[PDB]
């Protein structure tokens, strides 16, 4: 599967973005850093859709996708 | 954000329309007009001078997604901030909102603090 990485998050944004990711897919191997959040994405949701959703909160440059 | 910014609250139920208006007033926003559906909203937007649209999802004649889409494709109000009000954080609905160009979405019933958070994120995001 693929890997999502979220950077430079402000206070609260890690939980907020974890939940937001919840509404859209089932996350595994979730890693909650102090101002970062990473996880393994099943693949059942198009990446572009994710970016569009998280952008309700953060900026695109704070989102990265890569193979595991 | 300028407190006399003009809001347009769109919902087919008059009670929700009033709730949202009172909430905007609790936040210091008093320049607010209401609309009953997508069609009614587009018609009112024509008057111009609107700085913010808060719209519900479910409405007859024209629902919220369609109102949003029409706003975005309209070269004269294309960048108008639009907050979608939905009754459920539903996966398929949130994507549609995101791709359609919504400035954000909020699940009802919502609080005044939630609305403020929503407004500020949008103001901040657009340098308002
Ligand atoms: Mn409704």
Curated annotation (Swiss-Prot), chain A:
It is found in: Cytoplasm. May have three functional domains: one for interaction with CheB and CheY, a second for regulating phosphorylation and controlling the stability of the protein, and a third for receiving input signals regulating CheA activity. An in vitro complex of CheW/CheA(L)/CheA(S) in a 1:1:1 ratio increases the autophosphorylation of CheA and is required for the binding of CheY, the phosphorylation substrate. This complex accounts for 10% of the total number of molecules. Involved in the transmission of sensory signals from the chemoreceptors to the flagellar motors. CheA is autophosphorylated; it can transfer its phosphate group to either CheB or CheY. This is Chemotaxis protein CheA. It comes from Escherichia coli (strain K12).
């Amino acid at each position: 599967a693929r890997r999502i990485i979220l950077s430079r998050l402000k206070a609260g944004e890690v939980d907020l973005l974890e939940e937001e990711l919840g509404h859209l897919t089932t996350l595994t191997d979730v890693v909650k850093g102090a101002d970062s959040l990473s996880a393994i994405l099943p693949g059942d949701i198009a990446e572009d859709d994710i970016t569009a959703v998280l952008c309700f909160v953060i900026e695109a440059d704070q989102i990265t996708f890569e193979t595991v | 954000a300028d407190k006399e910014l003009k809001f347009l609250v769109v919902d087919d139920f008059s009670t929700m329309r009033r709730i949202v208006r009172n909430l905007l007033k609790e936040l210091g926003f008093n320049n607010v007009e209401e609309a009953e559906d997508g069609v009614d909203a587009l018609n009112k937007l024509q008057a111009g001078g609107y700085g913010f649209v808060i719209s519900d999802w479910n409405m007859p004649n024209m629902d919220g997604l369609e109102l949003l889409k029409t706003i975005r494709a309209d070269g004269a109000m294309s960048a108008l901030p639009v907050l979608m009000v939905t009754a459920e954080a539903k996966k398929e609905n949130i994507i549609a909102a995101a791709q359609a160009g919504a400035s954000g979405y909020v699940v009802k019933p919502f609080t005044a603090a939630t609305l403020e958070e929503k407004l500020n994120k949008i103001f901040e995001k657009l340098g308002m």
